[PDB]
Every structure is written in structure tokens, then in C-alpha cells.
């Protein structure tokens, strides 16, 4: 009776599992670590903070190592419910890290949105929005304090913390450019919101303080850090109207070993819109009613999962004249590649192809060395934009090779690649090892 | 004395701040070279 | 209509002679500095 | 508080009803510490 009845029922087929065992995991031994403390310290912003303005913040050297950095904004909403869509990261137009004069990385607002949509998942993603959007149908005039955590190579991985105690000779700083227009806060569509408040920004950095022997070791020894970079050059789409299946051949200007190639298609006017607009509930302003229009999204629901409103038909990557893998349909890059590699759900309009087994992981697991490829081209075939977006009968019931007529608004082509590089810290001076 | 020192509220002995120079030193340079052209790099001499 | 304040922070510098600057740069120093300790709290003032 | 007859004419243990607004308690201490400076590095000898 009980568990003893299967323990005695022992034989040869058990040896591969329990014969001459190596571990018992009911006695877990935890490894003793190095004494440290975490502190949040406010930084001082250089330059006037404002819409369309660029400011810089130099990180005050109060502690030994840097891990996360969170940008704090105070925003007042100029619209009502459903008029905003992650406005905090739209405002944070771009950020770059400069170590002693050498730039390491450059992130853009639509990257932050892509990353959140592609790699951050479950409750975490929802909480991210809580920190970056208004999610409980708040009304006009509401004030909210927003937080946009940064995702550079050291921000979310303690193991890659920036070793300030070992950069005795270099300045470490971030540059911040804030967007000129934020939907529902400064502009509603392309129309200015009269009386809109100017959001206030503060940049906070979380410091790690080390004990006696480890601080000495970090300060006096050289370091080899494996770091991540974001590569980006923007382009334009070729989205057709009727009877033509467009195809683009975008030669990539990426360098170095990367983890993946990711892209989306954007409506430059409506931040975060990666799909067509259609008279489907939750897809457009007034959707489902006589006031419905397909020229204006229901901004609080800008992102969707209905691939029918997607613009991409099929794609492949070609290297040096030869195919990298066989042609796959657009739905393959939106749902299957992230299933096989990230483990989350990717919304419609965001597409991923990985070169790595764990592209979401910090541990290197495969790559693509673009600096050794003569011609890397991304081939994108588009859907025919013949569906009348105003008729749910046509939007919810048509073939796989067609999309909405309103897809022609996704005129910006955003292709990103995420890199590997090495950050060398020697005699208090930092710089990256590999050029290009 | 009614009490002995409990050991509470101790201090760090001779704590130094972060070693930070005011020199903003030259960005360290890359170890490799800018990659050029693999098929026709450095130019091809053309005969007269 | 209240205007924003304009602030300018001025610092008084001491320039010393060459021999004393040498001593300051080379030698260890200990300064018996003063600190201020403060936390805010609340008091219970009676009525009647 | 509005009647000088009481405010200027009462005893040591009695004050005005308006004293009840002095609700913020501010307690300051001034102490020594030592600033130790050696070869370009400095810090508090007794740090917290």
C-alpha cells in the first residue's frame, strides 16, 4: 500500500533512472554569494525636457555596478478612454548608451513596443502596460506617473551590470530624445490638443554597492563582458491596392553575430499600429456602429491578434544569392517562430525569424554572422489589399492572400537585428572590441 | 553603566567613494579593422 | 503670474602657492568635519 | 488666540488654541566624522 508499493517494484528498467544515482534533490545546497546592496538614486537631467527636445543624463557614480535604469514620466491625458496606446514609451522616442564617447546601443520607441509585443509575455507584459499606459478607462484630465524600464544589455541581467568602479577614466551616459507628438496626450491623430500639459521626466538608476574584497577585485581587474546591441536602419513598404502581389528585396546592412531578425510594418501617423484598420469591434473608433470609421483606430486597442488584417503574405531570408530557408507564409513568422523560440504570443503585424535556439535567453544559443555574408536580403511578399475594410462580412470571411484596403497605410518598414559584441574594461577605460 | 553596547548602529571603517576621474578620457579604440570588401577590396590594378 | 526663480551658484576658490600645493597633492589629510543628522516626525499637541 | 486679555495674561502651562497647528516635529543633531583624503581618493572615516 502506498508509495512503498512502487519502490519495491524495482527492476532492470529502473537502472537508467535510479541505479548508481548522482544526486538527491531533496537536500538542495545553495551557493554562498557576495554581499551587495541595491539602491535607487535619482539622476539629474541635462537640458530642457520637452516634446521634440533632446536631453542627456550622465550617471552619477554613487555605487559600484549599474543594473536597471527606469525613466519616469508624469503625464496628463488630453483625451478620454481608449485614446492612448502605451504613450509613455511613444514619448521615449529613443535612447542610446555612450561609454567614454563610443556609442554601444540605440533603441527607438517602436522597438520598445516591438520588444514588449514580441519578448515580454503573460502578466509581465500586462504590468508593463500598467507602467506605460492608462488601462482602467481613465478620463480626460487624469494624471498618472509612468515608468519605462530600459532594456539594454545590462539593465535586466545582473550578470552584465555596468562596472562603474572599473571605468575610473570614462563617463557613462544616456541620451534621451522625446517624441514631438504622443497620441492622446499632445495630439489626437494629427490635431493638436489645446492646453496639453508638458510631461515631466526624471531618470532613475538602480545601483549595486559591493563589499570589501569584491569591490577591490572589480576595481583592479580587467573585464570581458558579452553584451547585446540593437541594429536598425528604417525603410519604406510597397503595399499594393488591387490585383498586384508586391515583393520587396531589402538588402540588409547588418553586421556582426546576431540572435535574430525581426520586423514589423508601421503606420507613421498611428504609433503602434502594425495591422490594417477594419470595422471590427475593438479595431476602429466607433467600430460596429454607424459612426464607425476605418481611418481612425480605437487607439486603446491598436494592437490585435487577427492576422487577417496583416499586410505580409510570405517571406524568406536569402544569403549571397542562395536561400537561407524555404519560403514561409507571413503567419509562420507571426506565430510559429516565436512559439518555437520565445514561448509567448506575438500580436499581428510583428514578425520574427530566429537564428538562435533561445533568442530570448541571455545565454548564446546560435547566431548569424552578418559581417561574413556578402549579401543578406529580406524578401517580403505582400497581400492584395482588396477587402473593403468597412464591411465585416468581407473582413471576417475572405481568403488568406488578401488584406484590407486600409493596409496601404503601413508605409514604414522597420527591420531590426539584435547583436553580440564584447565590452572591454581595461585600466578604467571602456570600449567595444569589434568595429562595424 | 546600566547597559553594554548592543552592537547596533555600527559604521563602515574608512569607506572611500567611487574612483572617478575628471578627465573624460579618449574612447578606447576597436581591436579589429573596419571590414571592407571581400570580392574586390583594396582596388584592382588595371593594365595600360 | 509668479515668475520662476533664477539661481546661480557661486563658489569661492583658494589658489595656493607652489610649495603648499605640492604638500597638499602628495600628503595624506584627515579633516575633523561636521555632519547634520535629520529625519522628520510628528508631534501630538493637545487641545484643552 | 484672538483675545489679548488671555494671550498676554495667562500662566506658564497654558498657550493659545492655535498652537495645535505646530504638528511638524523637527529634531536635528550635529556631529563629528572625519574626511580622510589619500592619493586622490577620499571618504568618511565612519561611514553609514
Amino acid at each position: 500500500a502506498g508509495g512503498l508499493s512502487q519502490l519495491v517494484a524495482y527492476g532492470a528498467q529502473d537502472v537508467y533512472l535510479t541505479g548508481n544515482p548522482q544526486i538527491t534533490f531533496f537536500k538542495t545546497v545553495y551557493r554562498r554569494y557576495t554581499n551587495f546592496a541595491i539602491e535607487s538614486i535619482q539622476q539629474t537631467i541635462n537640458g530642457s525636457v520637452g516634446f521634440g527636445n533632446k536631453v542627456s543624463t550622465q550617471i552619477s557614480r554613487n555605487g559600484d555596478l549599474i543594473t536597471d535604469i527606469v525613466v519616469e514620466f508624469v503625464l496628463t491625458k488630453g483625451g478620454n478612454g481608449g485614446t492612448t496606446y502605451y504613450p509613455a514609451e511613444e514619448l521615449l522616442q529613443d535612447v542610446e548608451l555612450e561609454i567614454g564617447g563610443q556609442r554601444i546601443d540605440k533603441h527607438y520607441n517602436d522597438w520598445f513596443r516591438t520588444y514588449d509585443a514580441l519578448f515580454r509575455m503573460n502578466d509581465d507584459r500586462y504590468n508593463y502596460r500598467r507602467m506605460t499606459d492608462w488601462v482602467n478607462n481613465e478620463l480626460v484630465g487624469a494624471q498618472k506617473r509612468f515608468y519605462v524600464p530600459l532594456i539594454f544589455f545590462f539593465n535586466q541581467t545582473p550578470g552584465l551590470a555596468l562596472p562603474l568602479i572599473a571605468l575610473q577614466y570614462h563617463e557613462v551616459k544616456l541620451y534621451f530624445t522625446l517624441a514631438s507628438q504622443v497620441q492622446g496626450v499632445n495630439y489626437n491623430g494629427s490635431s493638436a490638443i489645446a492646453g496639453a500639459a508638458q510631461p515631466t521626466m526624471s531618470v532613475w538608476v538602480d545601483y549595486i554597492f559591493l563589499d570589501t574584497q569584491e569591490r577591490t577585485r572589480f576595481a583592479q581587474l580587467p573585464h570581458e563582458y558579452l553584451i547585446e546591441q540593437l541594429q536598425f536602419t528604417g525603410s519604406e513598404t510597397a503595399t499594393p491596392s488591387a490585383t498586384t502581389q508586391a515583393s520587396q528585396n531589402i538588402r540588409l546592412n547588418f553586421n556582426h553575430p546576431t540572435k535574430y531578425l525581426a520586423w514589423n510594418f508601421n503606420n507613421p501617423t498611428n504609433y503602434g499600429q502594425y495591422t490594417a484598420l477594419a470595422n471590427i469591434p475593438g479595431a476602429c473608433s466607433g467600430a460596429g456602429t454607424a459612426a464607425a470609421t476605418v481611418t481612425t483606430p480605437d487607439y486603446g486597442n491598436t494592437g490585435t491578434y487577427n492576422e487577417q488584417l496583416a499586410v505580409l503574405d510570405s517571406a524568406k531570408i536569402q544569403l549571397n544569392g542562395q536561400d537561407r530557408f524555404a519560403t514561409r507564409k507571413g503567419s509562420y513568422f507571426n506565430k510559429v517562430q516565436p512559439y518555437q523560440s520565445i514561448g509567448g504570443v506575438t500580436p499581428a503585424g510583428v514578425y520574427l525569424y530566429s537564428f538562435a535556439l533561445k533568442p530570448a535567453g541571455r545565454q548564446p544559443s546560435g547566431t548569424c554572422n552578418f559581417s561574413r555574408i556578402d549579401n543578406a536580403t529580406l524578401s517580403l511578399t505582400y497581400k492584395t489589399c482588396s477587402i473593403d475594410a468597412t464591411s465585416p462580412a468581407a473582413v471576417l470571411g475572405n481568403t488568406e492572400t488578401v488584406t484590407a484596403n486600409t493596409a496601404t497605410l503601413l508605409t514604414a518598414l522597420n527591420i531590426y537585428a539584435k547583436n553580440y559584441n564584447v565590452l572591454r574594461i581595461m585600466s578604467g577605460m571602456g570600449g567595444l572590441a569589434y568595429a562595424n | 553603566q546600566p547597559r553594554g553596547y548592543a552592537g547596533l548602529r555600527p559604521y563602515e571603517k574608512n569607506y572611500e567613494g567611487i574612483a572617478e576621474a575628471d578627465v573624460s578620457a579618449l574612447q578606447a579604440r576597436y581591436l579589429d579593422q573596419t571590414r571592407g570588401r571581400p570580392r574586390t577590396g583594396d582596388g584592382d590594378t588595371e593594365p595600360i | 503670474g509668479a515668475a520662476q526663480p533664477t539661481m546661480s551658484v557661486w563658489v569661492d576658490y583658494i589658489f595656493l602657492d607652489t610649495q603648499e600645493r605640492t604638500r597638499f597633492a602628495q600628503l595624506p589629510h584627515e579633516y575633523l568635519i561636521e555632519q547634520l543628522q535629520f529625519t522628520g516626525s510628528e508631534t501630538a499637541t493637545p487641545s484643552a | 488666540a484672538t483675545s489679548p486679555a488671555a494671550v498676554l495674561g495667562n500662566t506658564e502651562t497654558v498657550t493659545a488654541n492655535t498652537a495645535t497647528l505646530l504638528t511638524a516635529l523637527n529634531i536635528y543633531a550635529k556631529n563629528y566624522n572625519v574626511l580622510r583624503i589619500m592619493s586622490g581618493m577620499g571618504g568618511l572615516a565612519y561611514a553609514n
Binding site: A219, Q220, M426, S427 | - | - | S39, M41
Partner: peptide
């Protein structure tokens, strides 16, 4: 003559990044 946090000792490299000096003029 130096506290440890000041710098990693310079050796086994020759980028010629930093100057030698007396530190007083």
C-alpha cells in the same frame, strides 16, 4: 602609495591611451 580602487594596474597592453606626469604645474 595608492589606494586599491584607483585603477587596474597597466600591464600586458600598449594602446598608448594615457600620459605619464608629475600632476602639478
Amino acid at each position: 602609495p595608492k589606494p586599491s580602487p584607483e585603477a587596474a594596474d597597466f600591464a600586458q597592453f600598449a594602446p598608448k591611451n594615457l600620459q605619464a606626469q608629475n600632476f602639478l604645474t
